[PDB]
Subunit: 103 residues, 5 copies
């Protein structure tokens, strides 16, 4: 298994590490049908999503998708600095694969 | 996928953006049969619901409805300022589709 | 849909509004078989339960029962003032149908 | 339904009330197979478990077991004083049936 | 049942106690397919994982794996000092079996 977010991110195609080093500026959550998703933005202007669950996801990802949304909300609310995001860059906005935080 | 709440809200009919820019004044939660719902009010006087799950909801929305209720409670309790709500205006009170918070 | 706890509470029989305006004094939680329930008391001496799930509950209430117990715990722990409780008065102690909090 | 932890505890065999009146000293959580359990200790030296789910549990207890572990963690982390524990004394360490907290 | 993390850890093969006595330095969470996992590091330079769920896990562990990831996040966020980790040493990085915290 990978030992860092960067190492994990390299195990995939169409991914890149964004070094954020900042707390989340805005949190957006939708329960509208077909748009069950979370959107986060930063001071940098960069916007990121957790995608709507769909056929691009395998079973093992369903709970992890829910976990990521849980993490984004509590990260937002505690003003916790996110270190890095591993994101897929074939989606608009870029889609969150992994998150890291340092303290 | 949409990049902001406003953009997401535009992908639906009978929706409008309320710019709230305030913490939640009151939180009401019900486990009474056929009224399994949350109601939030603001200082502005405006009241909003998360609807009882029903036939107007698709399967993908069940977990998101529960998420929205989770978010409203923790938002309330932390006195977090809500920025915008995307709501359906063909329900009374208006029904929450999406929420945003800025920091 | 109702716009306030009081309005919601009036849609049912054997219910009444208790104006609490206080934080929870004691929180009791049981995982003993047939007594999977939460009990709360106040400084006023009044005691309230979330009933054990049973045949008086419809399916849509299962998740809401669990939510109400979640809310009672976090409310207790944060010393959050409860405003009102809608309770069923044909149970001993009185059984929680809805809760409100103002800030 | 019972109105206090003590009253609830008396509806069972092999149970006793421990008056703790203290915050949790240590929290131990295991995800090892056949040892999916939580252990808590106190300054008094007394140790308590939430048992591994097994055939001694009825269906209605599955969620309540998970709730009890949730409560123990958040209680530990907030340094919340536990008042009383209703425990089964036919297990080693004694097994948690109910918990109460006063404020 | 075991009464301490050390005692529990001894009921398994390929395990060892790491005495950490420190808060978590970094928290990494991934929802990428086949890498649904959490990684934590410490100031000591030691890295640990909660493994991706797979055939090495029995059914009773599914909920416990999710709980462990919940605990790591909230532990990280509250800067709570971990005391000990029971870890499997036949995985890279070492894989978390149990955790303890003292206060
Ligand atoms: C790049 C891509 O299409 N990914 C989609 C994936 O396709 C699989 C293979 O992609 C990789 C990858 O994601 O980069 C290759 C990695 O080595 C794998 N990494 C690890 C650590 O296992 C991952 C991983 O297995 C999956 O992501 C987990 O589900 O997959 C890709 O190389 C392979 O391509 C085949 C192709 O299918 C076939 O038509 C052609 O004949 O040959 C190609 C070259 O071999 O296909 C793999 C699956 O068959 O498939 C998943 C569903 O399994 C998704 O569709 C994924 O798309 C991304 O999904 C993300 C969410 O998980 C997110 O939405 C991204 O935006 C999507 O692009
Ligand atoms: C307006 C309406 O009745 N919406 C109900 C919806 O109906 C479907 C179509 O809905 C839209 C919409 O809701 O605005 C159109 C959007 O482009 C869609 N957006 C996206 C991003 O896909 C949404 C979305 O797919 C759904 O909301 C997700 O469930 O749907 C609606 O336009 C369509 O109307 C047809 C009509 O049926 C047909 O006779 C006629 O010839 O063509 C019309 C369009 O040209 O019907 C669609 C259903 O097949 O359906 C959902 C559940 O399926 C809801 O019932 C929705 O009502 C709202 O539900 C909300 C909660 O999700 C909330 O309760 C609101 O108050 C409800 O009005
Ligand atoms: C009062 C009562 O007995 N409630 C039980 C309920 O019975 C149903 C009807 O009750 C009402 C009510 O609770 O006030 C009537 C309301 O208008 C309804 N309000 C709304 C917004 O929907 C509610 C609501 O539907 C339910 O609470 C949700 O399940 O129900 C009751 O009037 C009706 O009695 C009829 C009977 O059906 C008929 O055959 C007889 O001959 O005459 C009566 C009078 O016309 O029966 C309804 C059910 O068929 O049913 C639910 C289960 O669905 C429960 O059993 C409920 O008991 C309460 O449950 C609470 C928690 O949910 C709590 O434990 C209380 O202590 C219980 O009394
Ligand atoms: C004491 C005991 O062995 N309990 C096990 C239980 O057995 C049932 C009866 O237990 C009581 C009890 O716990 O004291 C009696 C109480 O009045 C009941 N209280 C309420 C509110 O219902 C409880 C309760 O029903 C259950 O605990 C909920 O699951 O049960 C016990 O009296 C009865 O014993 C019979 C025996 O079966 C029969 O052969 C003999 O002829 O007469 C005896 C006296 O009537 O059996 C009852 C069920 O068959 O069953 C549960 C699960 O079904 C557990 O096995 C329980 O063991 C405890 O489980 C705890 C966790 O829930 C914990 O791990 C303890 O360490 C276990 O002892
Ligand atoms: C060492 C190993 O490979 N363990 C895998 C396990 O194998 C079972 C036995 O493992 C023990 C153990 O892990 O120490 C023995 C303990 O006494 C048990 N402890 C308790 C408290 O009950 C545990 C426990 O029951 C399991 O973890 C339950 O999930 O298991 C192992 O001794 C036994 O090996 C046999 C072999 O099968 C047989 O061919 C040969 O003739 O004799 C051997 C030695 O007597 O096999 C047992 C299974 O039948 O199986 C589990 C899944 O059931 C895992 O695969 C486990 O591998 C580890 O899994 C961990 C996560 O759970 C982690 O990822 C580690 O990295 C894996 O090594």
């Amino acid at each position: 298994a990978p030992q860092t977010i960067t190492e994990l991110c390299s195990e995939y195609r169409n991914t890149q590490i964004y070094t954020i080093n900042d707390k989340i500026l805005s949190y957006t959550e939708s329960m509208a049908g077909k748009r069950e998703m979370v959107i986060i933005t930063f001071k940098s202007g960069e916007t990121f999503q957790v995608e709507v669950p769909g056929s691009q996801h395998i079973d093992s990802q369903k709970k992890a998708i829910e976990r990521m949304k849980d993490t984004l909300r509590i990260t937002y609310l505690t003003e916790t600095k996110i270190d890095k995001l591993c994101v897929w860059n074939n989606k608009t906005p870029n889609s969150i694969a992994a998150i890291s935080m340092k303290n």
